[PDB]
Amino acid sequence: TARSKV
Amino acid sequence: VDREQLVQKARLAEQAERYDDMAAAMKNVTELNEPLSNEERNLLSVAYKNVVGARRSSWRVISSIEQKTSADGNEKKIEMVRAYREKIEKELEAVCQDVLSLLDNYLIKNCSETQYESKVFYLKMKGDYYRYLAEVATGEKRATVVESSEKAYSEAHEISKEHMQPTHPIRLGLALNYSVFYYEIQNAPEQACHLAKTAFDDAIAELDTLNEDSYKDSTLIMQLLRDNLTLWTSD
């Protein structure tokens, strides 16, 4: 799955 | 308590990993109706990200168990799991409404015409918390929060394109979360890939605009934009 900004 | 003491309490709570106390402190700072500094803006963001994040992680774990438990067909267990998912959902939704009201009634409201960075930062946050609401919502309730998330991201994207450099960490960060919104929430992989590729290609075209103080922050997001694109064009 894709990662969003930390 | 004076504003300085509240900011210092948030700094302490962060170190003590007491994110509810950190969010409470930054909410009080916001409620003073004076604009937040870059440091204060990030203290608020980190606080609420960790608070909602705890519920998001729990919700995912319970939902995963609920899917497996539904297969075995245990009447008493399924209800208990369903109820627990609903308990965490309500907690998550309350955190999102808390953030969204601060954004709408204080933060976005007090942004001046020239305060582009803050306006994009807060609209991106608005998009993020409506996306977190979408993640748990179903039916017409989901359609509503998805529409709200799109409206917030779309506005932030228009401002960032007009007033910010393609290499700006806030601009890249928005493009990252907005593309994630298109893929995961809207199920629009073509729109997700186009947004992530345009953002990456525009930042690559003007690498000369990278700032000595924020080059590492920009490249870190650019890596995530390529990682997501590699993933999405493999799937």
UniProtKB/TrEMBL annotation, chain A:
Per the entry, what this protein does is: Inhibits post-transcriptional processing of cellular pre-mRNA, by binding and inhibiting two cellular proteins that are required for the 3'-end processing of cellular pre-mRNAs: the 30 kDa cleavage and polyadenylation specificity factor/CPSF4 and the poly(A)-binding protein 2/PABPN1. In turn, unprocessed 3' end pre-mRNAs accumulate in the host nucleus and are no longer exported to the cytoplasm. Cellular protein synthesis is thereby shut off very early after virus infection.
Q: Which residues cross the membrane?
A: none
Q: Which family does it belong to?
A: Belongs to the influenza A viruses NS1 family.
Tell me what gene encodes this. Answer: NS
**Where does this one sit in the cell?**
Host nucleus; Host cytoplasm
Q: How does it assemble?
A: Homodimer. Interacts with host TRIM25 (via coiled coil); this interaction specifically inhibits TRIM25 multimerization and TRIM25-mediated RIGI CARD ubiquitination. Interacts with human EIF2AK2/PKR, CPSF4, IVNS1ABP and PABPN1.
Q: What is known of its domains?
A: The dsRNA-binding region is required for suppression of RNA silencing.
What lineage is on file? Answer: Viruses, Riboviria, Orthornavirae, Negarnaviricota, Polyploviricotina
Location of Phosphoserine modifications:
4
- The protein's name is Non-structural protein 1
Q: Superkingdom, according to UniProt?
A: Viruses
Within the intact protein, the region shown is 225 to 230 of 230
